[PDB]
Short mmCIF file of N, CA, C and O and ligand atoms in Angstrom, two decimals:
data_model
loop_
_atom_site.label_atom_id
_atom_site.label_comp_id
_atom_site.label_asym_id
_atom_site.label_seq_id
_atom_site.Cartn_x
_atom_site.Cartn_y
_atom_site.Cartn_z
N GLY A 1 27.72 -79.31 -55.47
CA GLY A 1 26.54 -80.14 -55.76
C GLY A 1 25.43 -79.88 -54.76
O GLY A 1 25.41 -78.82 -54.14
N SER A 2 24.52 -80.83 -54.60
CA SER A 2 23.36 -80.68 -53.71
C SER A 2 23.77 -80.58 -52.23
O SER A 2 24.40 -81.49 -51.68
N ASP A 3 23.43 -79.45 -51.61
CA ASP A 3 23.77 -79.07 -50.25
C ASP A 3 23.03 -77.77 -49.91
O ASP A 3 22.95 -76.85 -50.72
N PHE A 4 22.55 -77.71 -48.67
CA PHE A 4 21.80 -76.61 -48.06
C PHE A 4 22.70 -75.56 -47.40
O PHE A 4 22.35 -74.38 -47.41
N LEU A 5 23.83 -76.02 -46.85
CA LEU A 5 24.94 -75.29 -46.22
C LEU A 5 24.70 -74.90 -44.77
O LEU A 5 23.60 -74.53 -44.35
N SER A 6 25.79 -74.93 -44.01
CA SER A 6 25.91 -74.52 -42.62
C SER A 6 27.39 -74.54 -42.21
O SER A 6 28.11 -75.43 -42.66
N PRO A 7 27.87 -73.62 -41.34
CA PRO A 7 29.19 -73.71 -40.72
C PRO A 7 29.19 -74.52 -39.42
O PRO A 7 30.20 -74.56 -38.71
N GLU A 8 28.08 -75.17 -39.10
CA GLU A 8 27.83 -75.89 -37.85
C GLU A 8 26.99 -77.15 -38.06
O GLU A 8 26.25 -77.27 -39.04
N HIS A 9 27.07 -78.04 -37.06
CA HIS A 9 26.20 -79.20 -36.81
C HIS A 9 26.58 -80.49 -37.53
O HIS A 9 27.27 -80.51 -38.55
N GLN A 10 26.15 -81.60 -36.94
CA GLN A 10 26.40 -82.96 -37.37
C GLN A 10 25.17 -83.79 -36.99
O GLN A 10 24.65 -83.66 -35.88
N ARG A 11 24.69 -84.65 -37.89
CA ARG A 11 23.47 -85.43 -37.69
C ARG A 11 23.78 -86.66 -36.82
O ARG A 11 23.88 -87.79 -37.31
N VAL A 12 23.97 -86.40 -35.54
CA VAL A 12 24.15 -87.36 -34.43
C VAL A 12 22.80 -88.01 -34.10
O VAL A 12 21.74 -87.42 -34.37
N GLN A 13 22.78 -89.20 -33.50
CA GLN A 13 21.54 -89.89 -33.12
C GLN A 13 20.70 -89.12 -32.08
O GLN A 13 19.52 -89.42 -31.90
N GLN A 14 21.26 -88.08 -31.44
CA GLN A 14 20.62 -87.27 -30.41
C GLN A 14 21.14 -85.83 -30.42
O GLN A 14 22.19 -85.57 -31.01
N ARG A 15 20.45 -84.93 -29.72
CA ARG A 15 20.85 -83.53 -29.49
C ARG A 15 20.58 -83.12 -28.03
O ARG A 15 19.55 -83.49 -27.46
N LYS A 16 21.50 -82.34 -27.45
CA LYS A 16 21.47 -81.85 -26.06
C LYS A 16 22.16 -80.47 -25.95
O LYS A 16 23.08 -80.28 -25.15
N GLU A 17 21.78 -79.53 -26.82
CA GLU A 17 22.33 -78.18 -27.02
C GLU A 17 21.59 -77.45 -28.15
O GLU A 17 21.24 -76.28 -28.01
N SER A 18 21.33 -78.11 -29.28
CA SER A 18 20.63 -77.51 -30.42
C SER A 18 19.11 -77.64 -30.27
O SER A 18 18.58 -78.73 -30.10
N1 FKZ B 101 26.23 -80.43 -48.12
C1 FKZ B 101 26.41 -81.03 -46.79
C2 FKZ B 101 27.74 -80.60 -46.12
C3 FKZ B 101 27.75 -79.15 -45.59
C4 FKZ B 101 26.63 -78.80 -44.57
C5 FKZ B 101 26.54 -79.76 -43.35
C6 FKZ B 101 27.78 -79.79 -42.44
C7 FKZ B 101 28.18 -78.39 -41.95
C8 FKZ B 101 29.14 -78.41 -40.74
#
C-alpha cells in the first residue's frame, strides 16, 4: 500500500545522528 520505503529510521520526537 502507500509507503515511500527505507531500510532505516523511525519518526522519534528528536534526532541526534540523522
Ligand atoms: N511504509 C512505511 C514503513 C516502511 C518505511 C519506514 C520504516 C523503515 C525502517
